[PDB]
Symmetry: C2
Subunit: 330 residues, 2 copies
Amino acid sequence: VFPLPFKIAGLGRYVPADVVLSSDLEKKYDLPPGWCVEKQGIRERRWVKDETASFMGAEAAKEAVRDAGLKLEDIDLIINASGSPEQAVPDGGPLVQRELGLGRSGVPSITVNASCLSFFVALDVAANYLNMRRYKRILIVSSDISSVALDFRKPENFTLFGDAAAAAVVTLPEPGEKSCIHASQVRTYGYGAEFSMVPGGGSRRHPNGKNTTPEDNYLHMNGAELLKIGFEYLPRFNEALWKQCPDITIKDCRYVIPHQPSRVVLDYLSLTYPDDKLVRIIDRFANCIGASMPMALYEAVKVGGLRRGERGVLTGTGSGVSFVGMVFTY
Amino acid sequence: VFPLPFKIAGLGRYVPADVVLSSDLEKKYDLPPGWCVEKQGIRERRWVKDETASFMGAEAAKEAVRDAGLKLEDIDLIINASGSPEQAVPDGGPLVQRELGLGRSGVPSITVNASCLSFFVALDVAANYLNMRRYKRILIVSSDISSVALDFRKPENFTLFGDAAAAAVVTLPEPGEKSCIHASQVRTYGYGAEFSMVPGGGSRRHPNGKNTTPEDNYLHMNGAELLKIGFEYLPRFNEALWKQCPDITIKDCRYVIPHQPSRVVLDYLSLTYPDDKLVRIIDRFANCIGASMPMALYEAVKVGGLRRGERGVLTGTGSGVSFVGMVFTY
């Protein structure tokens, strides 16, 4: 089953142009100087002006398609893999297809939704399509605008969130190329759904039924209970992941590339590994939801110089609660 | 690539218990007697009392798991494939996992979102997971509560929509079993996104930003423009689908099993094929969004007596605009 041929052929990013400095937010909203860096690990973030999520996704996608040495017309499947929707109907796949100028192309455009970790699950889904020879050149797009949900009365909210899009084009490797997935794993603990959720935005508490409460559209988080899920299930998760690739260990991997919605995951990793092994984007882009992991993947290659033949580990914990992990040769 | 081993091992359904007769709606809201049947093709529908979407999905799933001769603990991947969300965070996968009593199981639970046609795309995704030997016993759940979005001032709305859930367990076939997919195709024409959309419920028009209009939470449909997309692209879609299985034609298939959000698809099919070839559920369950196709699949097997070794065709047009088609041996 594993080693699965798989090539990240191209990578792309779009971020809004204007830097919002933590220092300026602190001055504006009477927070102590240095508060965002100390408490959140965030020095800067980017917020949209008039961009739509599909716009940002399409900009990232075009970069990834160029990076792969391809034209837009060569893409044969589009997977939207964002942490939040642009609108209720259609899903983000057709919307980014349209934004790319491919609206009359017929190219199937769908959404994979694992909340947080949609990009990860989309890579997995794409790997299977590729190895089954169903499609050859798959675009995965993760674009999130969180700045819409900002609450400027709560510092733990309005200093945490940023906007970003990142994209990948994935293909089978060419003959002789080592690019592959050595291990991949997804586990879900839905008992933790209530500890990180947004109860509004669907049929359960529809804008006006009989089950609506005042706080329906904001994130309800119980950090202590989320950690307990980690305590109980993460060690067995990690054991099972690395058992898939017994000939490869963390020592053989150049970068750990985490979903990073807060500084906690980076702090944990920083106690364990040298700083140079960890790919950090939260410091400059904040919590960008579903774009976090692919932003970090973009960073690993385009700033960290990850070379073909070197190995990386994708890792993340997301709402649902789900855990993901993938060991790959780039 | 095609014939792909694939077995629909079990099927399940949940519908609310109380029948809402078109005749009673006509009396209540001063419509002419027989209006729903003539205009919509709908004699009855079911509307929830206090059920959640996850509840209905879990009820359907349990039936499907029993039908497959399995226990819930045997399922190794859950795919939520509904036409609408229960809430914004997490996605419906973890929520149905929790509802099933599998919240501490670790079983990956995700969402595939192709609007309308999510069930179809989930079958495809599942087929690839199965044939890549990644998972063995995959649960696909489609549960939709549309009755929340009813507008009792617009007859074309409040008489059209029903609530339902349906589910399938899919596996590889046992040795000697003929169950397979002969052909599968998905095409998307995102230029048609604007002709069937809900502009609210996301980042584009977030409950209060600067881009909200009065009509954001209702379906904007342009039926004439939707048909033009069919005129232009459906004939080539169908040609390309049947070219995948040159040794099998529509004459070799016992049932056509359509996504049926309105009477138009059934009217088209009824002009072409004998009535007994068409599987109809809209008459008793109305437009149940993402549950429509799997409701019809449940009907084909559990009422229409589709036998192992007989062939069927899944077909549908959905918001995005996307078209889907699959030819299979049951």
